[PDB]
Amino acid sequence: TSELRICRINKESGPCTGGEELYLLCDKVQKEDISVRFSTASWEGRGDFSQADVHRQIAIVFKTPPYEDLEISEPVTVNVQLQRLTDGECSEPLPFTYLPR
Amino acid sequence: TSELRICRINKESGPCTGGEELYLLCDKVQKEDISVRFSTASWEGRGDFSQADVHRQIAIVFKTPPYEDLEISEPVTVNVQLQRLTDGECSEPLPFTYLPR
Missing domain, CATH: 2.60.40.10 (Immunoglobulins)
Incomplete structure (x- = not known):
């Protein structure tokens, strides 16, 4: 099927x-x-x-944004969260860590 | 929020x-x-x-079933797919590979 x-x-x-x-x-x-x-x-x-x-969920596919400093010698874990456009209210943060090149 | x-x-x-x-x-x-x-x-x-x-999706949380042979010396990649109970119609398979202990 x-x-x-x-x-x-x-x-x-x-x-x-x-x-x-x-x-x-x-x-x-x-x-x-x-x-x-x-x-x-x-x-x-x-x-x-x-x-x-079995949960009904929403999935968002997106490309990560380049980090401010591309010359970091060590990992930098930043915050990631949803944010409404209208009222700009964010969700709780979830960690994501940028790795050096 | x-x-x-x-x-x-x-x-x-x-x-x-x-x-x-x-x-x-x-x-x-x-x-x-x-x-x-x-x-x-x-x-x-x-x-x-x-x-x-932004896609509406269903997510199923489940525990994997033990593989038939627990003494495998090499990885065994098997099939994984959804299957309806009523008519037993399966979905396309997706690979998942069991690793030795």
Whole structure:
């Protein structure tokens, strides 16, 4: 089906032990009629999650802005947050650290 | 504001050069009245993106299932896809590779 589409899995590697919590982004699905399946030609495994683990989210794709100082010899972790244009009200900050060249 | 909340940034590091495309997950926002802001006490930068870069998405949080063989000496990349319970129709596969212990 084309209706079901996974956009991505936050991580692409993990221990063969499993039990590792991850998240995947995808298109519309029904939390009551959906499941995740790991598999190979002769093996199949299922992701462990409930309906409460299926969240409606907004995703913003953007290119980072160059940092003020391009000659930094050490990492600089700055703030990143959403900000409304109209009233300029920001969200809580989330860290992102710029790396030297 | 508590209305605006970022759940996460796919990456937490990048070159100070900027221009690096990333994506961030967050709660409800208005694509016409929203913006991303990078900053420090005395500096501010803006994420580069348009309305077409704000997507409504579903995110599923789940724990990976242990792989069949826990004694693998080399990485095994298997398939991962959504599958409907009712009609068992799967989505295209996305790779995920199990790592040895």
